[PDB]
Amino acid sequence: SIPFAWLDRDKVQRLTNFLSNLENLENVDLREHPYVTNSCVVREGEDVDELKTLYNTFILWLMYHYVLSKRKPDYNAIWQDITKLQNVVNEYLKSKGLNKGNFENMFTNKEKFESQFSDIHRALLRLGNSIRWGSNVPIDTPYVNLTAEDSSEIENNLQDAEKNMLWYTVYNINDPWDENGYLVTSINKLVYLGKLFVTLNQSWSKLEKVAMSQIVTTQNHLSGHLRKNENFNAVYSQRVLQTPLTGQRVESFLKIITSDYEIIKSSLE
Amino acid sequence: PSNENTILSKIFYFCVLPALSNNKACGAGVNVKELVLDLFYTEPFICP
Amino acid sequence: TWIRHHVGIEKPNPSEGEALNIITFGGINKNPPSILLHGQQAICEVIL
Amino acid sequence: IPFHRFFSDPGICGTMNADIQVFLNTFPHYQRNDGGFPLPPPLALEFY
Amino acid sequence: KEEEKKKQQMLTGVLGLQPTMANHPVLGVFLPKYAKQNGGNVDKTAFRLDLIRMLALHRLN
């Protein structure tokens, strides 16, 4: 039941509060806000908390990565809407719509990199298309071209997605005001949803690599401290805390360290 | 398995063993449970 | 697309609708060899 | 540090770094020693 | 008190180990964890193999 180290009754409540309501506060970066990592301290200087805060921060990073992998919603919905717009509207305009291009260039410019696209030049080609449909020539503000009343709000929405990728909203392309019709609204929706998708996935992979790097970092310190003594409970705690970890290993390992909590607590000196 | 390791594993079992052995191998299974509970779990191992 | 490129044919699509329907009614390459020195040629193919 | 035409073995580099190892495991045809699998784009200046 | 009888019953079920071996540290630590199990349908052989590999882990000179 919610395992932590030689740690008090107020900080347990604050840690469980933060890890429960991780979704609602902004800027979810546990690195960036230090109110939690400095809080999970054992106390009494250095001697009576070095190995113990090492274990406690190990548990903290581990269960942070656990609640990340348990609480991230599905982004394939927003890529499903990207595939719906990209496939249905713009291809039918380029081929069935007429006077646009040729089969091989456009259809494969949309079709290429279904899986794992970070491509900006394809986006630039669609922005050049919609800008040619619109009023002006340059590529200054391309995402909702011909109107800057929502540019600050949509940049704010992308920054809020970078901060909290776990709770994300899709703003909207408004209906009554538009430079052109169904085509330019489809293009603006397509480019914003593509930027949102790549933003969410890059921020997520950033945080997941951060959490795995911190856990693998603290394991070596914990092993270097625990290696010296030769008791059986000592070497069993060594092996439990030297099991190798991956992101898909962390859930079962949390369930293992739950049952092994009662022995490593005595194994710590 | 690394990409090298898997490719070499296929090379070994599909090429190196049958060519050098002229198909004189056989597959094999094991009860490791009854194996170790017959061999081990005896007096020098169990007694402290 | 990879097979069409690697056998070295353009006009990427057959354009499988009405265009093909027209082609069954009869259609040439519409780009003659700009140089030709010896007249007609065509070679069929039996695999063996 | 893969920097040159030579001295850039991917099977060596992807064992010291896990980032190359997930890179080659997504794109296995860059595991070849023969040609040039991509150096860092400030380093890969082939015509220069 | 019933818990001690469960521990001893599991000790005799594992191998019929003697109390002299029950006093061993690897046993002294793991008998309580084997108490919170084997009430299920799990096995008797699994506990023997577990004791084997744990006793082995213990003795690495």
Curated annotation (Swiss-Prot), chain A:
One annotated GO molecular function: structural molecule activity
Compartments where located: Virion tegument
Keywords: Phosphoprotein, Virion, Virion tegument
Source superkingdom: Viruses
A cellular component term, taken from the record's GO annotations: viral tegument
Entry PTM: Phosphorylated at multiple sites.
Coiled coil: none
SUBUNIT field: Homotetramer. Interacts with the major capsid protein. 180 tegument protein pU11 tetramers bind to the virion capsid.
Protein family membership: Belongs to the herpesviridae large structural phosphoprotein family.
Name this polypeptide is given: Large structural phosphoprotein
Gene: U11
Residues of the full protein shown: 7 to 275 of 858
Swiss-Prot record, chain B:
Location within or outside the cell: Virion; Host nucleus
Summary of subunit composition and partner proteins: Homomultimer. Makes the hexons and eleven out of twelve pentons. Interacts with triplex proteins 1/TRX1 and 2/TRX2; adjacent capsomers are linked together in groups of three by triplexes, heterotrimeric complexes composed of one molecule of TRX1 and two molecules of TRX2. Interacts with scaffold protein; this interaction allows efficient MCP transport to the host nucleus. Interacts with capsid vertex component 2/CVC2. Interacts with the small capsomere-interacting protein/SCP.
Source organism per UniProt: Human herpesvirus 6B (strain Z29) (HHV-6 variant B)
Protein known as: Major capsid protein
Role this protein plays: Self-assembles to form an icosahedral capsid with a T=16 symmetry, about 200 nm in diameter, and consisting of 150 hexons and 12 pentons (total of 162 capsomers). Hexons form the edges and faces of the capsid and are each composed of six MCP molecules. In contrast, one penton is found at each of the 12 vertices. Eleven of the pentons are MCP pentamers, while the last vertex is occupied by the portal complex.
This protein's encoding gene: MCP
Superkingdom, taxonomy of origin: Viruses
Family statement drawn from the similarity comment of this UniProt entry: Belongs to the herpesviridae major capsid protein family.
Record lineage: Viruses, Duplodnaviria, Heunggongvirae, Peploviricota, Herviviricetes
Positions spanned in the full protein: 770 to 817 of 1345
Curated annotation (Swiss-Prot), chain C:
Location relative to the cell: Virion; Host nucleus
Subunit structure: Homomultimer. Makes the hexons and eleven out of twelve pentons. Interacts with triplex proteins 1/TRX1 and 2/TRX2; adjacent capsomers are linked together in groups of three by triplexes, heterotrimeric complexes composed of one molecule of TRX1 and two molecules of TRX2. Interacts with scaffold protein; this interaction allows efficient MCP transport to the host nucleus. Interacts with capsid vertex component 2/CVC2. Interacts with the small capsomere-interacting protein/SCP.
Described purpose of this protein according to its UniProt entry: Self-assembles to form an icosahedral capsid with a T=16 symmetry, about 200 nm in diameter, and consisting of 150 hexons and 12 pentons (total of 162 capsomers). Hexons form the edges and faces of the capsid and are each composed of six MCP molecules. In contrast, one penton is found at each of the 12 vertices. Eleven of the pentons are MCP pentamers, while the last vertex is occupied by the portal complex.
Family: Belongs to the herpesviridae major capsid protein family.
Protein name, per record: Major capsid protein
Organism: Human herpesvirus 6B (strain Z29)
Included stretch of the parent chain: 1106 to 1153 of 1345
Curated annotation (Swiss-Prot), chain E:
Entry keyword Methyltransferase: no
GO cellular component: host cell nucleus; viral capsid
Superkingdom in the source lineage: Viruses
GO biological process terms held by the UniProt record: viral process
Sequence similarity: Belongs to the herpesviridae small capsomere-interacting protein family.
Task performed by this protein: Participates in the assembly of the infectious particles by decorating the outer surface of the capsid shell and thus forming a layer between the capsid and the tegument. Complexes composed of the major capsid protein and small capsomere-interacting protein/SCP assemble together in the host cytoplasm and are translocated to the nucleus, where they accumulate and participate in capsid assembly.
Subunit structure, as described in the record: Interacts with the major capsid protein/MCP.
Protein name in the entry: Small capsomere-interacting protein
Organism per entry: Human herpesvirus 6B (strain Z29) (HHV-6 variant B)
Designated gene of the protein: SCP
Parent sequence residues shown: 23 to 83 of 89
